[PDB]
Design an enzyme around this catalytic site. Structure first.
Site, PDB file in Angstrom:
ATOM      1  N   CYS A   1      -5.512   0.671  10.504  1.00  0.00           N
ATOM      2  CA  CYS A   1      -4.063   0.307  10.290  1.00  0.00           C
ATOM      3  C   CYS A   1      -3.200   1.154  11.086  1.00  0.00           C
ATOM      4  CB  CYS A   1      -3.278   1.524   8.418  1.00  0.00           C
ATOM      5  SG  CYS A   1      -1.380   0.442   8.648  1.00  0.00           S
TER       6      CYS A   1
ATOM      7  N   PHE B   1      -6.924   4.454   5.706  1.00  0.00           N
ATOM      8  CA  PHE B   1      -6.422   3.180   7.050  1.00  0.00           C
ATOM      9  C   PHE B   1      -7.556   2.696   7.931  1.00  0.00           C
ATOM     10  CE2 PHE B   1      -3.353   7.023   6.052  1.00  0.00           C
ATOM     11  CZ  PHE B   1      -2.590   6.210   6.018  1.00  0.00           C
TER      12      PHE B   1
ATOM     13  N   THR C   1       0.867  -0.865   0.138  1.00  0.00           N
ATOM     14  CA  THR C   1      -0.264   0.190  -0.083  1.00  0.00           C
ATOM     15  C   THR C   1       0.404   1.054  -0.028  1.00  0.00           C
ATOM     16  OG1 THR C   1       0.253  -0.470   2.376  1.00  0.00           O
ATOM     17  CG2 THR C   1      -2.295  -0.847   0.905  1.00  0.00           C
TER      18      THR C   1
HETATM   19  C1  HEM Z   1      -0.298   4.002   2.695  1.00  0.00           C
HETATM   20  C2  HEM Z   1      -0.323   2.679   3.864  1.00  0.00           C
HETATM   21  C3  HEM Z   1      -1.296   2.263   3.990  1.00  0.00           C
HETATM   22  C4  HEM Z   1      -2.809   1.911   4.060  1.00  0.00           C
HETATM   23  C5  HEM Z   1      -3.186   3.049   2.960  1.00  0.00           C
HETATM   24  C6  HEM Z   1      -3.200   1.122   5.010  1.00  0.00           C
HETATM   25  C7  HEM Z   1      -4.742   1.097   4.434  1.00  0.00           C
HETATM   26  C8  HEM Z   1      -4.503  -0.647   5.443  1.00  0.00           C
HETATM   27  C9  HEM Z   1      -6.335  -0.608   6.296  1.00  0.00           C
HETATM   28  C10 HEM Z   1      -7.846   0.135   5.109  1.00  0.00           C
HETATM   29  C11 HEM Z   1      -5.995  -1.166   7.375  1.00  0.00           C
HETATM   30  C12 HEM Z   1      -7.957  -1.547   7.246  1.00  0.00           C
HETATM   31  C13 HEM Z   1      -7.862  -3.199   6.814  1.00  0.00           C
HETATM   32  C14 HEM Z   1      -9.757  -4.001   7.183  1.00  0.00           C
HETATM   33  O1  HEM Z   1      -9.779  -2.390   7.857  1.00  0.00           O
HETATM   34  O2  HEM Z   1     -10.292  -4.647   6.821  1.00  0.00           O
HETATM   35  C15 HEM Z   1      -5.061  -1.976   7.521  1.00  0.00           C
HETATM   36  C16 HEM Z   1      -4.982  -2.771   8.678  1.00  0.00           C
HETATM   37  C17 HEM Z   1      -3.622  -2.977   8.708  1.00  0.00           C
HETATM   38  N1  HEM Z   1      -2.689  -2.434   8.348  1.00  0.00           N
HETATM   39 FE1  HEM Z   1      -2.405  -1.004   7.345  1.00  0.00          FE
HETATM   40  N2  HEM Z   1      -2.453   0.261   5.217  1.00  0.00           N
HETATM   41  C18 HEM Z   1      -0.527   1.036   5.006  1.00  0.00           C
HETATM   42  C19 HEM Z   1       0.558   0.717   5.924  1.00  0.00           C
HETATM   43  C20 HEM Z   1       1.065  -0.273   6.230  1.00  0.00           C
HETATM   44  C21 HEM Z   1       2.111  -0.356   7.173  1.00  0.00           C
HETATM   45  C22 HEM Z   1       3.011   0.372   6.655  1.00  0.00           C
HETATM   46  C23 HEM Z   1       1.608  -1.347   7.676  1.00  0.00           C
HETATM   47  C24 HEM Z   1       2.967  -2.180   8.543  1.00  0.00           C
HETATM   48  C25 HEM Z   1       4.311  -1.916   8.485  1.00  0.00           C
HETATM   49  C26 HEM Z   1       0.391  -1.882   7.798  1.00  0.00           C
HETATM   50  C27 HEM Z   1      -0.109  -2.922   8.600  1.00  0.00           C
HETATM   51  C28 HEM Z   1      -1.601  -2.952   8.597  1.00  0.00           C
HETATM   52  C29 HEM Z   1      -1.649  -4.251  10.074  1.00  0.00           C
HETATM   53  C30 HEM Z   1      -0.832  -5.054  10.375  1.00  0.00           C
HETATM   54  C31 HEM Z   1      -2.796  -4.027   9.870  1.00  0.00           C
HETATM   55  C32 HEM Z   1      -4.829  -4.648  10.733  1.00  0.00           C
HETATM   56  C33 HEM Z   1      -5.022  -3.764  11.559  1.00  0.00           C
HETATM   57  C34 HEM Z   1      -5.663  -5.156  12.680  1.00  0.00           C
HETATM   58  O3  HEM Z   1      -6.760  -5.165  12.702  1.00  0.00           O
HETATM   59  O4  HEM Z   1      -5.338  -5.262  13.409  1.00  0.00           O
HETATM   60  N3  HEM Z   1      -0.518  -0.826   7.247  1.00  0.00           N
HETATM   61  N4  HEM Z   1      -4.568  -0.730   6.856  1.00  0.00           N
END
Ligand code: HEM
EC number: 1.14.14.1
Length: 439
Positions: free
Chosen positions: A383, A376, A251
């Site tokens: 996120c 996010f 992402t």
């Molecule tokens: C611009 C960059 C990013 C965007 C747009 C983004 C977006 C998202 C979104 C929308 C979710 C929610 C998913 C859902 O509701 O099903 C999410 C969850 C998550 N993201 Fe990101 N992400 C980004 C970068 C990152 C980075 C750099 C990491 C780790 C280093 C990451 C790790 C995670 C993790 C582990 C989850 C699950 C969180 C949980 O439910 O506890 N993301 N992300």
């Protein structure tokens, strides 16, 4: 009263499926949303979902007392390889809350600790571009992926993928992209995936064999939860490794690619961003403190996430029988999908020029409505890597804009590839070095 929910034409048993016969299902759904509005139902043989596009409805769906995170077909398809690690676990599975408390301190302060290793990869990106001959050009998403994968591998795991020492994509990426595509393709199926999963696991053992013979990996192997007191099991840990290697980089690469895309397409926005980079980034390499002063670079990045949020949809389910928006009854279990690019185009929030790239929309964020901007995700399932993604992106874009002038030499036409994340496929540029010393 209670209204009929809009729904696109059905085609016998095929339901609404013949309407998503595409490798770009999110862009297709955005068109259905433009036609039918803020909510529509969508049925494919065996399954039904309701797509939301307005801040007014999404604001309700984001009420965690009423709706929790659902694993969409796509995330179910993905749970095969990342199990009950953070991204593909249900909120009620014990390992969700447990990994969340155990992993959360790794994400501003951990950031200070990560900065130097972020700079290590970012300098490798700049040097690559500085070393290109005049006849050459950059494959933007391909180099951004080299950067963001190497950044998570180093900051998360003290492992060097050494992506910049290869002119093909890392062997780990190639499986990743095919497994994501296949999870997405599997969706339009009415009635290599083992090989791609095995190749990912293959790398996890490398990482695991490495620390064996203060970062994310530390807290996965040694950290315990201040509730149950229990640590992560090995099964789950393998699961969190795989998790952070994917979401940890895909992402953010998409974001940095869309950001440069919009900048070259908006030369006055580019000028202002380059101006900030030069005055703020006065040292040979950037400090943690300087990255934090790149105000307009962060506005640029937020506006790129506004247009093309790179993880473009998330799924929710009704915890109990409920009414949505005072009009749409839902039964316990009913799936809602949030169409984030459509949310970010809601004219009642954003005004009527939603397609333009205007970073100044974010000039004072403490005046954007709540639940209007959600690149996010939401609530306790938002996120975990938000600040890590943003710091990395701002650092890297800042250094790019300091060290080069960019040329859209092919007059690139935006083509957005979907692998349940978004990227501008085929985006290329030329970068003319400003001949500014590094450290
Ligand atoms: C611009 C960059 C990013 C965007 C747009 C983004 C977006 C998202 C979104 C929308 C979710 C929610 C998913 C859902 O509701 O099903 C999410 C969850 C998550 N993201 Fe990101 N992400 C980004 C970068 C990152 C980075 C750099 C990491 C780790 C280093 C990451 C790790 C995670 C993790 C582990 C989850 C699950 C969180 C949980 O439910 O506890 N993301 N992300």
């Amino acid at each position: 009263t209670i209204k009929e929910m809009p729904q696109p034409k059905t085609f016998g048993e095929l339901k609404n499926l013949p309407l998503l016969n595409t490798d770009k299902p999110v862009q297709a759904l955005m068109k259905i949303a433009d036609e039918l509005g803020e909510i529509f139902k969508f049925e494919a043989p065996g399954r039904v979902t309701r797509y939301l596009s307005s801040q007014r409805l999404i604001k309700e769906a984001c009420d965690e007392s009423r709706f929790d995170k659902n694993l969409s077909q796509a995330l179910k398809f993905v749970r095969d390889f990342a199990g009950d690690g953070l991204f593909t676990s249900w909120t009620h599975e014990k390992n969700w809350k447990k990994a969340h408390n155990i992993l959360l301190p790794s994400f501003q302060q951990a950031m200070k600790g990560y900065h130097a290793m972020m700079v290590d990869i970012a300098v490798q990106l700049v040097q690559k571009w500085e070393r290109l001959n005049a006849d050459e050009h950059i494959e933007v998403p391909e180099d951004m992926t080299r950067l963001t994968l190497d950044t998570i591998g180093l900051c998360g795991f003290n492992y060097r993928f050494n992506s910049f020492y290869r002119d093909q994509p890392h062997p780990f990426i190639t499986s990743m992209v095919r497994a994501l595509d296949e999870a997405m393709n599997k969706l339009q199926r009415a009635n290599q995936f083992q090989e791609d999963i095995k190749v990912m696991n293959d790398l996890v053992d490398k990482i695991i064999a490495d620390r064996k013979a203060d970062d994310l990996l530390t807290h996965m192997l040694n950290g315990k939860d201040p509730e149950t007191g229990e640590p992560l099991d090995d099964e789950n840990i393998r699961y969190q490794i795989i998790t952070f290697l994917i979401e940890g980089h895909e992402t953010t690469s998409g974001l940095l690619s869309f950001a440069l895309y919009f900048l070259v397409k908006n030369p006055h926005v580019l000028q202002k961003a380059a101006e900030e980079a030069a005055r703020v980034l006065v040292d040979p390499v950037p400090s943690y403190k300087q990255v934090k002063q790149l105000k307009y670079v962060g506005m640029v990045l937020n506006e790129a996430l506004r247009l093309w949020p790179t993880a473009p949809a998330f799924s929710l389910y009704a915890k109990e029988d409920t009414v949505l928006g005072g009009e749409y009854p839902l039964e316990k279990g009913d799936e809602l999908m949030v169409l984030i690019p459509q949310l970010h185009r809601d004219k009642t929030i954003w005004g009527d020029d939603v397609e333009e790239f205007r970073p100044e929309r974010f000039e004072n964020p403490s005046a954007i409505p709540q639940h209007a901007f959600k690149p996010f995700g939401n609530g306790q399932r938002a996120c975990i890597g938000q600040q890590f993604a943003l710091h990395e992106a701002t650092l890297v874009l800042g250094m790019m804009l300091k060290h080069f002038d960019f040329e859209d030499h092919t007059n690139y036409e935006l083509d957005i590839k979907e692998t349940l994340t978004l990227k501008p496929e085929g985006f290329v540029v030329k970068a003319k070095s400003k001949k500014i010393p590094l450290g």
